[PDB]
């Protein structure tokens with residue numbers, strides 16, 4: 001007849017231009033999802049501007065008239081976040097995806113059988129793009145033609161995803177030319193609202209919360225996401241690819257894909273080093289990644305604020321790239337005070353989601369610390385006039401900026417270097433109101449892997465385990481991931497970074513933070529820097545090395561309560577090790593490596609002799 005040829009529906013580009021396997025992915029899914037048109041994205045400025053104005057004319061976004069090319073999306077309140085409960089990974093065997101927990105409920109991932117997924121898929125995708133354009137987004141995670149970069153193709157029915165993916169990845173025609181006949185991750189996305197609409201459209205924001213499902217199929221190199229337009233559910237390069245699929249790839253291939261910022265720190269003498277840090281969301285990665293140091297002569301430069309791909313090179317340096325092309329940061333809390341470098345970044349060419357709008361076309365959120373002129377009013381993220389009298393924030397707590405990384409005033413000159421940046425330190429941390437000192441240093445690589453494994457952080461009151469800040473993101477069995485980290489010591493050449501753990505959030509008996517934080521965290525970074533150099537600035541404790549007395553620069557800082565801030569209590573740490581023991585036994589068990597169990601035994605013994 002005319003085959004399975006969708007050429008007649010192509011409104012930009014050509015199916016004949018596509019590499020063979022890309023064409024097959026596009027056409028097969030056009031046959032399944034029945035889009036009205038196919039738009040192959042070129043990544044051009046013209047494409048982007050027109051798509052924005054189109055969304056503008058449909059009421060999907062508003063233009064923010066105060067700024068150079070900035071935009072505002074307000075969502076359906078049912079679709080406001082990446083949703084872990086609807087997030088699953090498919091493998092033949094459950095144990096390959098998560099360890100089998102002794103308690104029967106795993107905190108370390110959600111598995112679904114191939115059978116169950118096929119039924120779920122068939123219930124969702126057939127005809128799901130009826131009446132819509134299927135956009136084909138060819139994208140690079142990493143600098144174009146970096147040896148560490150990986151290519152994806154995302155099919156989506158959301159122009160919001162297209163625009164946001166232009167920022168957060170490298171996308172367009174240059175990627176298709178770079179890809180050629182190579183392998184790529186297949187990323188399928190639908191908002192799940194075929195036309196004609198069966199359910200009312202809320203806030204011009206297409207979604208299907210009842211059928212929302214974010215699936216990963218590592219053995220097929222597929223990510224298939226249905227029903228949410230938001231964040232990590234729809235922007236498939238970010239979590240789905242650059243952590244969940246990429247952690248699996250990394251394990252197979254001998255590298256690491258982690259939930260880590262990469263920042264550069266320069267002393268007053270001009271001396272430079274790169275550091276990576278894994279904190280859970282809402283524990284300050286973006287802030288640290290673009291920190292404005294208070295300590296004079298110190299400089300911080302940003303490589304990435306969220307994801308790090310790391311591979312030992314043939315010299316044994318741990319090379320890291322940021323696979324992202326932008327920051328997708330939580331907007332609330334961002335002020336000139338807390339994060340001035342973010343604020344300079346987001347003044348132009350930025351897409352805001354679920355933040356408030358001022359009457360003069362500006363953006364507003366909790367913690368912005370920017371007084372408004374009398375007469376200037378605020379429209380909340382729910383499209384209502386808002387005042388601080390109300391018992392609701394003007395912006396959703398998970399609201400966002402999505403901004404190009406290149407616009408960061410302190411973007412590192414090597415942030416796109418195809419070889420990556422050499423990592424000399426790896427920092428773990430989160431929110432611990434009690435017990436855990438400002439900073440310590442792991443005693444060995446094995447100890448450091450244990451420190452990552454043991455991470456706990458206040459929920460954003462409950463304290464939960466979040467190993468390596470990867471709890472939401474492991475692409476495979478966490479015990480095996482532990483073994484993969486430990487295996488890095490068994491290769492000759494590898495120059496293993498020093499591992500540290502931090503805590504900004506230690507609080508006193510009256511619930512006041514014992515440490516100021518923010519730009520004062522440069523004093524902790526200072527202590528860390530010297531240690532990589534070999535400075536004799538450390539005191540041994542049961543948990544690791546801490547700063548020696550007077551080793552931290554507290555100058556310009558008045559009287560910080562250092563005794564409480566560095567206190568290490570036998571009673572706290574004996575409870576700590578017991579809790580950790582029971583967690584690893586329950587959640588990891590048969591897959592817990594011998595070396596991590598040994599480190600737990602060693603820590604317990606050192607605490608017992610306090």
Ligand SMILES: Nc1nc2c(ncn2[C@@H]2O[C@H](COP(=O)(O)OP(=O)(O)O)[C@@H](O)[C@H]2O)c(=O)[nH]1
Nearest residue numbers: 280281282283284285286287330333504517518
């Ligand atoms: N008290 C305190 N709060 C902080 C510090 N760093 C970040 N925060 C707060 O933690 C919240 C999350 O910051 P953010 O950079 O979004 O964390 P991310 O989600 O991990 O990238 C914001 O409300 C920040 O103001 C700190 O050093 N001390």
Ligand SMILES: [Mn+2]
Nearest residue numbers: 285286329330
């Ligand atoms: Mn962030």
Ligand SMILES: [Mn+2]
Nearest residue numbers: 259280281306
């Ligand atoms: Mn993150």
Ligand code: NA
Nearest residue numbers: 060074203204
């Ligand atoms: Na809207």
